[PDB]
């Protein structure tokens, strides 16, 4: 039968190990379970399976573009602040605005500036101008994890354009991740 | 509070799933969800302290006004070893799923129903904590844009 | 070892020195009848719990069962909970024989109607709770002398109905459930209206479930002599029923976003 | 039936609703109070429909006529330094009509709860339908009352508090509306 | 073996449910049941199978008497007094202390005193001067239990007498009951 | 017998009045999650005895190999 | 109470059955009797005394 | 009649068992009783009456 | 099943021979037979086998 303690008298300081699934009922009311899509939006693959924008840049010519990779404290990808280590398969979605010309892409976790001098080496997928790419840059990371919060938790991703002539435009940023792995969930964020 | 009289109230305000700091991130995040939400209420008193609280809630409800819990799902806490108190609410609305962000989950009230009583070496008044999380049935359904700027 | 380890010590020395008349003493330990236990009692929605209980007490060898085996109320043990399906009279009205086609004779709040005063069976439970689900059974009565005819439409209208009421054209409303009913032939009208809605839930004293009109088919053709005042009636039953939200006595209470 | 159950509720709630546990009275014992002294009462049974915001408010007044089973709560707590004793016990209209007749101290031969404070903090008294009619006029105090006496007054320390509350909780085991009548009109099923 | 809660430790409050026939012993003691006689006195078909007076009427003509029926305050009787409910077979004993006549007797438990106007229908069994009759009255009680202690908790008793010339006297009456059924033992009542 | 015979009654009670609908009382009694027990760890060459223990805890599905 | 010695008395009296509620019903009804007779003393004090 | 409206009472009154001639004589026998009470009402109008 | 006729609709004219003991119901209603006393008071040789004034 049902005991005192699944009807609600309990003692808070009898809580650990973390992750308690004790069931709560009284006897009008049992845990059902209903549910109204084929699948789960809370699994971290599905819903961190989607992107979410990230930044932009605005090029008038060739120079390169790095900049830090992190976890969004404002879209749907803030869930992520729950936790505190993360590693996996990164997706990155640029979009190249531009008339005529390449855009060059690169991802990398070294923190070196210099390793990204030579481009090539890294990767560099090409999208043509007007065209827009979606590349998946694995776990390249030289440290096992990579705490969630980092101002570059994710790698650092690079861009430079080939342009033709005096052409300019500007290199909106999307971001997802493939299968994330997520360990030891912290406290909560605040708000601004 | 030794205090307050039998039916004077010691809490009550409107809850919103967002009024928790974990929850409040999966409403900046879904849209909608379903399923019973459960508070727990910790109250720290010592040994010698013994009384009566009854908490109920009226889901739905949207008139931050005291009233008579004899109708609404509650709970009486009487003090011993395990004050920590909870309440279960199970998923009410017109909607199968309901909005994450939207019309409140009901009135939350917590009523004095016996003086709290204490002696010469025993606090007159305690502390109280009320926590908040999904129950087991819990399910967010549709993730939507962002309401507020985490940090 | 100890303190539980007395009453077999003193109880077993007083036994090994025993002699002809027997041990000259007897000791026993156990718990005490008030032992440190927690007590929980769930009635409906509600929970009680109790971390200093005590033996509960009852009456010289009671009978629970609560049922009059003499049956000094002949009436169905169950009768007080269906009460509020009961069928009642919604509504009344004297159709005008002037009354051109198409013109609406009456129409009744549904599902709120069913609480129209203080004085309906349901009226009681509906005030204890925000939330209702349930499916109707309507019998519209309209009775006219032979001499006289005449015909009038009762359909069912959902609130998508009556929102867009003057968009819709008359004569197709007998795709809603209805009853074309030609007086001098029918004195009343049966519909049996499910649980119709776009929410799964509709709050209690609310018209979100539509409602019940009753409109003039082909207007009163009364002879010189026949009477002219022809009352048209509405009454109501619950197929089903079902309260289940909380709620103050009577408070408006949003179960919509 | 909802099969996505919106309303994640037992089907039949809003049937056992009226037979909810519910408040039906508190008190505050006072510590310069007599033995034998009434603490509290409650109107039998009329007290479940003691407000219009009792959920068995509803029913009761569409039936002029009831049969019900009690189980009363009647909690009191006090710190542990403070000590006493209350007599919780249910008297059938005949107790309560002749009630002075009566030689207090022999009331343990009602259910009853001597209760000593200090020790325990809740008492428990199931009451089945206890009447010389079959059944009792709705809205009545046939059924008799619960009270609430003081067996030994409460001997509060210098320092302890002193404003011990007594509360009387009330479910109905069992209830049975049967008389239909007009609303709330006294109808009398006796002769 | 023996429990300390059998040597005399317990505890008031868990008393209940009512009616707990608990053994209590101690090294040189222990529940000795000794009868004297081959039956029982405190059985309540017993102790109540024995009448007891109840009152008396003095008659100088045949006017009717009519007396509430109720449960004694005086004798052995009273041990009623600690039940709340009674229903049985009323015995009711009559004497009727006359020189020459008839005494018409009859008992109902309703109220109406309209009823009892014409006697016959009732029951008026017939005492014939200088003779007692023992008549047992059934439970025709429009009220399924009787309230032990009602001025009327047993149903009104009516006497007339068909006296012949200017004959009076007086008739004494004691009442006891067959087998009886009492239910929810009350407190024990006060002294005068 | 008694104070722990209550869960039994009540809900028993409740039982034995139940009609069609069910029971309208469910009572269940036990003892509380803070029990008076007492607990003793020892680590090397030292031990700590702790007569008012509480439920140890530890992080989500942990690996304490090392 | 705290003040009452060791040795001291907090009651004493000479029992009869009238003395109590019950048990004087049946003196007033029976003339004899036999059997054991149980007295049950219930103090009511707080937690700390002792 | 055609004149009453609806809503309008035909007739009302308190109902005892004397009020039947048949049963008035069981009123003045018996004393007690149980059971349900059959009432029938039969209005006569003509075929073309609705 | 239950008829209409043993729902409250008949006619009066239709009630011969005498003697009809058509039963009567509604949903929450049924014909219930319960007996105070072990014997009839109603049968003729019982009430009538009590003496009265004359």
Redesign the interface.
């Given at each position: 039968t049902m005991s005192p303690n699944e009807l609600?008298?309990?003692?808070?300081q009898d809580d650990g190990p973390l992750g308690q699934?004790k069931?709560?009922?009284?006897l009008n009311?049992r845990?059902?379970?209903?549910?109204?899509?084929t699948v789960?939006?809370?699994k971290v693959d599905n819903?961190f399976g989607?992107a979410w924008f990230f930044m932009e840049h605005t090029f008038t010519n060739e120079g390169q573009w790095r900049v830090p990779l992190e976890f969004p404290?404002?879209?749907?990808g803030?869930?992520s602040?729950?936790f505190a280590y993360f590693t996996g398969e990164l997706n990155i979605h640029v979009l190249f605005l531009s008339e005529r010309g390449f855009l060059r892409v690169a991802h990398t976790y070294d923190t070196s500036n210099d390793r990204v001098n030579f481009l090539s080496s890294n990767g560099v997928i090409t999208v043509p101008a007007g065209e827009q790419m979606t590349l998946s840059a694995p776990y390249y990371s030289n440290k096992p994890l990579r705490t969630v919060r980092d101002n570059n938790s994710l790698g650092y991703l690079m861009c430079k354009p080939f342009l033709t002539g005096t052409s300019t435009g500007k290199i909106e940023v999307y971001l997802s991740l493939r299968c994330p792995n997520f360990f030891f969930p912290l406290?909560?964020?605040?708000?601004? | 509070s030794?205090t307050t009289a039998?039916?004077s109230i010691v809490h009550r305000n409107i809850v919103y799933l967002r009024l928790f700091?974990?929850l409040?991130?999966?409403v900046?995040?879904?849209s909608y969800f379903?399923?019973?939400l459960?508070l727990?209420l910790?109250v720290y008193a010592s040994?010698?302290?013994?009384?009566?609280l009854?908490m109920g809630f009226?889901?739905?409800?949207?008139?931050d006004s005291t009233?008579?819990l004899?109708?609404?799902?509650?709970?009486?806490?009487?003090?011993?070893?395990?004050?920590?108190?909870?309440?279960?609410i199970?998923?009410?609305?017109?909607?199968?799923?309901?909005?994450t962000n939207?019309?409140p989950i009901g009135l939350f009230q917590i009523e004095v129903?016996?003086?709290?009583?204490?002696?010469?070496?025993?606090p007159?008044e305690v502390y109280c904590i009320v926590q908040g999380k999904m129950?087991?049935?819990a399910?967010?359904?549709?993730?939507?844009?962002?309401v507020?700027?985490?940090? | 070892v100890g303190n539980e380890i007395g009453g077999n010590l003193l109880t077993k020395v007083a036994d090994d020195a025993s002699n002809i008349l027997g041990p000259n003493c007897f000791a026993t330990t156990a718990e005490p009848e008030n032992k440190?236990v927690?007590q929980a009692t769930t009635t409906v929605?509600?929970?009680?719990?109790?971390?200093?209980p005590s033996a509960p007490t009852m009456p010289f060898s009671p009978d629970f069962s609560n049922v009059d085996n003499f049956h000094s109320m002949a009436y169905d043990i169950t009768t007080g909970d269906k009460n509020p399906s009961k069928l009642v009279r919604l509504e009344t009205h004297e159709w005008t024989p002037s009354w051109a086609r198409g013109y609406q004779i009456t129409h009744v709040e549904l599902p709120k109607v069913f609480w129209d005063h203080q004085d309906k069976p349901a009226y009681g439970q509906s005030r204890?709770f925000?939330?209702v689900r349930c499916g109707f059974h309507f019998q519209v009565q309209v009775n006219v002398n032979q001499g006289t005819a005449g015909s009038a439409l009762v359909v069912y209208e959902p609130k998508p109905v009556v929102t867009y009421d003057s968009k819709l054209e008359f004569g197709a409303f007998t795709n809603l459930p209805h009853v074309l009913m030609n007086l001098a032939e029918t004195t009343q009208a049966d519909l049996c209206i499910p649980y119709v809605a776009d929410?799964?839930?509709?709050?209690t004293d609310s018209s979100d479930l539509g409602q019940l009109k009753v409109y003039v088919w082909t207007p009163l053709s009364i002879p010189t002599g026949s009477a002219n005042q022809v009352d048209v009636t509405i009454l109501g039953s619950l197929l089903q029923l079902d309260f289940?939200?909380?709620?103050?006595?009577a408070?408006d209470?949003?179960?919509?976003?």
């Open positions: 609600g008298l309990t003692s808070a699934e069931p709560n009922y009284f009311f845990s059902m379970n209903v549910d109204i899509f789960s939006h809370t819903l989607r404290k404002q879209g749907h803030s869930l602040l729950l406290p909560a964020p605040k708000v601004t | 030794a039998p039916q700091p974990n409040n991130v999966f900046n995040s879904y379903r399923g019973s459960v727990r910790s040994t010698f302290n013994r009384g009566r009854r009226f889901p739905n409800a949207t008139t009233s008579t004899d109708n609404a799902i509650y709970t009486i806490c009487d003090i011993g070893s395990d004050n920590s108190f909870e309440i279960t199970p998923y009410s609305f017109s909607t199968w799923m309901r909005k939207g019309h129903l016996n003086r709290l009583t204490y002696n010469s070496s025993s007159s129950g087991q049935d399910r967010f359904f549709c993730p939507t844009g962002s507020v700027t985490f940090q | 440190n927690v929605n509600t929970t009680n719990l109790t971390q200093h204890y925000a939330a929410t799964n839930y509709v709050k289940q939200n909380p709620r103050v006595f408070q209470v949003n179960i919509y976003d």
